[PDB]
Structure 1
């Protein structure tokens, strides 16, 4: 495809504001419709996942308008995504060759556990992603992902209006398909608000809970909660001075310690780019995805920046997520002038390994505009008690949230988004096909499983977070108990079978394994023991002994019961085939490599000879995956064959669950 500069030229020709050039790509047009089936408040990632999944699940059935108050896709924290998310992208027609032009490569999760009372000591837990011919995971800049999903939505009959705000004071939401009247303005100053008459409202306003907070107060869990503070840093090409052995920048890296943990995420940034130019670049990438352009013939990230007049750079997202029962010194003005800055630099110098690590990174000033060098957010975890009701439902963060750790936010949260997308078709049709009282009753009953799933979802994620946090207080519990159980219970068994039709059903069965019984039994023994040791104390060695032995005893039976064949010793660096810990083990599969030219991390596959980020040609041999233990040519061919394309929908197939096989 020859690249078009439609939006760049349209914007210049009419001197269009940012929201005006975006809204001009709507199928219905730049202005709001009088009527719609579904109005979605908020075009965060979940508002857009919802609209894309709803229209793709059953095309040309629902008219859907998304209202987003940001004039353009705004900054958001929450950048790490997982195989289920990529699979969802691939099911919606965008595979890794195209996604990697926009987003950073993620190849598994690695953890380093720092000893507090013995500064310099650490242990690790390392896993891998997948071969480039199986799948990828992504590190996404959220203004870019929201742009990609806006454009994809508009190309699929969904209207998306930026710079428009739902007025939750004058909006009327009523049940039984009688009719919502959603008030949409450009802000509180706006004299001329519009109304969209509609059947269903979707609250996707995130943590702001702008609608469902009117139906129930925010709910907090017992015990400590968490705070976060973070910033953006350079991404070094040469990672060899990082003080951890075998560190790799294309993992989501976790630096863990008694008070909490630090995320390290390498991802490219498009900040400084004009919005119209970005629309042309994204539109071109989708046209390339439509045409099936091979990766080696697709222009590199940097070439796209030159082609469309964009700004491109590599940055590292580094942040703290710590408990809110930590004791800070009263005076912290030696570490900065803002609180977020102060607590960040204070915590860095509390750990010699953190200070040594951070000394490889240079701080970026105001990457996302003024005032954005530092971020802080306090009291992270919460739950919405009421997530649906007559005329409305809520998705994503508006239902609840726990912690950045293991990225439940996007990757687990999309179970609600996609299930709600599927549920919306009968909800609207019920309203159009039955009188009001019966419609409201039938819809209420239809939504009981959605309400009940949501009600139980956040508490299970909360216990998962506390399980990991308490085990992060010891350098043996962290890797050998918490991480081991998360990956065993939460690895996505049978993901290669998921399609558009089964996706919501599969996703709600995942929950990162947090509902698995043996997982909760180990999680409860650990939490019950460790929560009785004050944070400023070291866990007694006998307590670690007892917990480690308990976990390994439950583990052996649950592992034996699982009927899913996995090369566990190839996927977890520190464990053998039966998930036994091996003290010195170091052998794992190798799926990635770092570009000698630009530093970007690449997936190994024979048909990707050039770097997708800068276009530099690597040597042919480098494209060879290393399987340890080895695979035959047939075993390798059989692997890649399973992951080529998703299966057609068979209404007689039993859905195979991601969680491990029950013992019974």
Structure 2
């Protein structure tokens, strides 16, 4: 495919603003339609996942318009994604070769637990991801992912309007056949707002909860909540002076301690690129995905930046998520002039390992515009008590949120977006096919399971978050209890069976394993014990012993009961096949390598000889995965065979759940 420069030239020829060049790619045109079946408020990641999945689940059935107030895809925190999200991208026609041009490779998850009272001591818990011929995970710059999903939506019959705001004072939402009148303006100052007549409104406005807040006050859980503060840093090519043994930058790394934890995410940034040029690059990448261009014949990230006139750099996202019962010194002016900067730098010097870690990184100023060197957000976790009603439903953050830890926000939250998308088809058809009272009653009953799932989802994630946080107060409990249980209960089994038709049904059974009974039994024992010890104290050694022994006793039975075959010892560095902790164990599968030229992390597979990021040819041998323990040639062939293409939809197959086998 020869690259085209359609949008770059259109924007120049017409002197078009950012919102105007984006909206010119809409199937029905750059102006709003007078009527739609579905109007989605917000084109964050979930509003777009919703619209893409709805159209892909049943094409040419619903007219869908997405309304987004940002003039172009905006900055968002929330960069780490999991196999379920990649699989969803692949089911929607974009596999790893194309996604790695845009996003950073993520291998596994790694945790380092810092002893507070013995500064310099730490332990770790280390996992790997998957072979390159199986799948990938991704570190995503959110303005780029939202651009990707906007362009893909427009190419699949969805209209997306940037620079437009839903007016929630004058919008009318009700249970009729076509009961909704969604008022859309360019802002509060706008004298000439438009109206979209429509059947279904989807609140995808995130934590702002712009519609469902009108239906119930925000709900907070008992006890402490969290605050976060974060910034963007350089990404060293040479990671060897990082003070943690065996550190690798293509994991989502977690630095954990009694007060909370630090995320570390290496990812490429496209900031500084004109939006029209980016549209041309994304469009070209989708055309290459359609044509099946092999990864070695696809331009590298840096080559795309040259071709389309873009800016490209490697950055590290680094932030704290700490409890809000931390006591800070009255005066933090020695650590900076703003609160976020102050608390960030103050926490860094409280742990010698964090200070030694951060000394490998240089702060980037205002990566996302003026005032964005530092971010702070307070009181993270909440739930919306009402997530649907006559003429509307809510998805994603607008339903509730807990914490960045284990990335439930995107990866678990897409269970709501994709289930809502599937349910939108009968919701709209019910309204077109029955009188008003019976339609409203039948839609309400259809959505009882959706409401009940959301009601139970956020509390289960909140208990999962507290479980991990309390265990992070000790360097044995963190890795040997909390991390262990999260991976045993939450690795999504039988993901290779998922397809577009079953995706929502599978996704709502996952919940990172936070519904697994044995997981909840261990979580409650730890939370109950540890919450009685003031944060400023060290856990008594006997409490750690008792909790460790209780966790292991519950673990043995639950592991024996799981009928799922998995090389646990190759995926979890510290554990054997039966999930017993092994004190010195260091062996693991090796799926990735670092480019010697640019520092980017790459997947090992025989058909990718060149770095996808800078294009530097690596030598043929380095392409080989290391399986420890070994796999035969046949076993390796069998594994790869299960991951080429997803199964066609069979309406008689029983769905295999992602969670461990019940004991019966």
TM-score by length of structure 1 reads 1.00
1:178 and 1:273 mapped to 2: Cα distance? 41
Instruction: Give how far 1:177 is off.
Output: 2.4
* Distance in 2 between residues matched to 1:67 and 1:527, nearest whole Å: 42
Question: Deviation digits for residues 414-448 of structure 1, max 9, x if unmatched?
Answer: 00000000000000000000000000000000000
Q: Does the CA-based 8 Å contact 1:499-1:649 persist in structure 2?
A: yes
How far off its partner does 1:317 sit? 0.1
Contact kept? 1:176, 1:438, Cα under 8 Å: no
Q: Does 1:103 align with 2:98?
A: no
8 Å CA contact 1:229, 1:375 repeated in 2: yes
> 2:447 matched to which residue of 1?
447
Cross-structure match for 1:637: 637
Gaps of 5+ in 1: none
State the alpha-carbon separation in 2 of the partners of residues 176 and 118 from structure 1.
Answer: 65
Paired position in structure 2 for 1:88:
88
Quick one: distance in 1 between partners of 2:481 and 2:175? 48
Are the counterparts in 2 of residues 396 and 409 from structure 1 also a CA contact under 8 Å?
A: yes
State the SS of the aligned residue for 2:261: strand
- Assess if the C-alpha contact under 8 Å between 2:91 and 2:646 holds in 1: yes
Tell me if the contact between 2:178 and 2:197 (Cα under 8 Å) persists in the aligned partners: no
Q: What are the superposed Cα offsets for residues 27-57 of structure 1, whole Å, 9 maximum, x if unpaired? A: 0000000000000000000000000000000
SS in structure 1 of the partner of residue 200 of structure 2: strand
1:113-157 per-residue CA deviation (whole Å, 9 max, x = no partner) reads 000000000000000000000000000000000000000000000
Gaps of 5+ in 2: none
Q: What is the CA-CA distance between 1:175 and the residue it aligns to? A: 0.7
CA distance in 2: counterparts of 1:353 and 1:556, whole angstroms: 34
SS for the counterpart of 1:35 is coil
Superposition deviation, residue 533 in structure 1? 0.1
Would you say the 8 A contact 1:300–1:612 is kept in 2?
Answer: yes
Per the alignment, residue 660 of structure 1 pairs with 660
CA offsets, 1:81-103, max 9 Å, x none? 00000000000000000000000
Q: Does the CA-based 8 Å contact 1:255-1:261 persist in structure 2?
A: yes
- How many angstroms does 1:516 deviate by? 0.2
Q: Distance in 1 between matches of 2:27 and 2:408?
A: 33
Aligned length: 664
Q: Which residue of 2 is the match for residue 216 of structure 1?
A: 216
What SS is found at the alignment partner of 2:36? strand
CA–CA separation in structure 2 for the residues paired with 1:413 and 1:568: 27
The 1-side partners of 2:146 and 2:292 are apart by 23
Give the C-alpha shift of residue 109 in structure 1: 0.1
Mapped partners of 2:570, 2:129: distance in 1: 11
Residue 267 (structure 1) aligned with residue 267 (structure 2) = yes
What residue in structure 2 maps to residue 330 of structure 1? 330
Shift of 1:161: 0.0
Does structure 2 retain, via aligned residues, the 8 Å contact 1:177–1:200?
no
* Deviations, residues 489-513 of structure 1 (Å, cap 9, x unaligned): 0001000000000000000000000
CA distance in 2, matches of 1:9, 1:492: 45
What is the CA distance between 1:178 and its match in structure 2?
A: 4.0
TM-score, length-scaled by structure 2: 1.00
Cα distance in 1 for residues equivalent to 2:186 and 2:109: 42
Report the equivalent of 1:56: 56
- Aligned equivalents of 1:175, 1:453: Cα separation in 2: 22
CA distance in 2: counterparts of 1:21 and 1:337, whole angstroms? 39
Provide, for residues 608-654 of structure 1, a one-character-per-residue CA deviation record: whole Å limited to 9, x for no partner. 00000000000000000000000000000000000000000000000
1:564-595 per-position Cα deviation (integer Å, ceiling 9, x unaligned): 00000000000000000000000000000000
SS in 1 for 2:199: strand
CA distance in 1, matches of 2:177, 2:543: 58
1:132/1:603 contact within 8 Å kept: yes
Q: Deviation string for 1:503-560 (max 9, x for gaps)?
A: 0000000000000000000000000000000000000000000000000000000000
Instruction: Give 1:12 shift.
Output: 0.0
C-alpha contact (below 8 Å) 1:78/1:410 kept by paired residues:
yes
1:237 is matched with 237
8 Å contact 1:178–1:436 — kept in the other structure?
no
Q: Does structure 1 conserve the Cα–Cα contact (< 8 Å) formed by 2:23 and 2:160?
A: yes
* Whole-angstrom distance in 2 between the partners of 1:7 and 1:179: 37
1:176 Cα deviation after fit: 3.6
Contact 2:239 2:249 in 1 (8 A): yes
Q: How far apart are the structure 2 equivalents of 1:147 and 1:559?
A: 42
Q: Aligned equivalents of 2:558 and 2:491: distance in 1?
A: 14
8 A Cα contact 1:122 1:475, kept in partner: yes
Which deviations, in whole Å up to 9, do the C-alpha atoms of 1:193-246 show, x marking residues without a partner?
A: 000000000000000000000000000000000000000000000000000000
Partner secondary structure for residue 40 of structure 1:
strand
| Alignment check: 8 A CA contact 2:574 2:584 kept | yes
Structure 1 segments of 4+ aligned residues over 3 angstroms from their partners = none
* Kept in 2: contact 1:177–1:440 (CA 8 A): no
1:315 aligned counterpart, secondary structure = strand
d(CA) in 2 for partners of 1:444, 1:647: 33
- CA distances 1:392-425 after superposition (whole Å, capped 9, x unpaired): 0000000000000000000000000000000000
RMSD: 0.3
Is contact 2:68–2:161 with CA below 8 Å preserved after alignment?
yes
User: What is the alpha-carbon distance in structure 2 between the residues aligned to residue 341 and residue 283 of structure 1?
Assistant: 38
Q: Report the CA distance between 1:311 and its aligned residue.
A: 0.1
Q: Cα offset for 1:179?
A: 1.3
Partner Cα distance (1:241, 1:527) in 2 = 36
Question: Is the contact made by 1:299 and 1:615 (CA closer than 8 Å) also made in structure 2?
Answer: yes
User: What residue in structure 2 maps to residue 159 of structure 1?
Assistant: 159
**Partner deviation per Cα, 1:159-201 (whole Å, 9 max, x = no partner):** 0000000000000000142410000000000000000000000
Residue 483 of structure 1: SS of its match in structure 2?
helix
Q: Name the SS for the 1:345 alignment partner.
A: helix
Contact 1:57 1:500 in 2 (8 A): yes
Give me the whole-angstrom Cα distance separating, in 1, the residues matched to 2:287 and 2:490. 35
State how far apart, in whole Å, the 2-side matches of 1:489 and 1:597 are.
39
Are the counterparts in 1 of residues 102 and 301 from structure 2 also a CA contact under 8 Å?
yes
SS at match of 1:277: helix
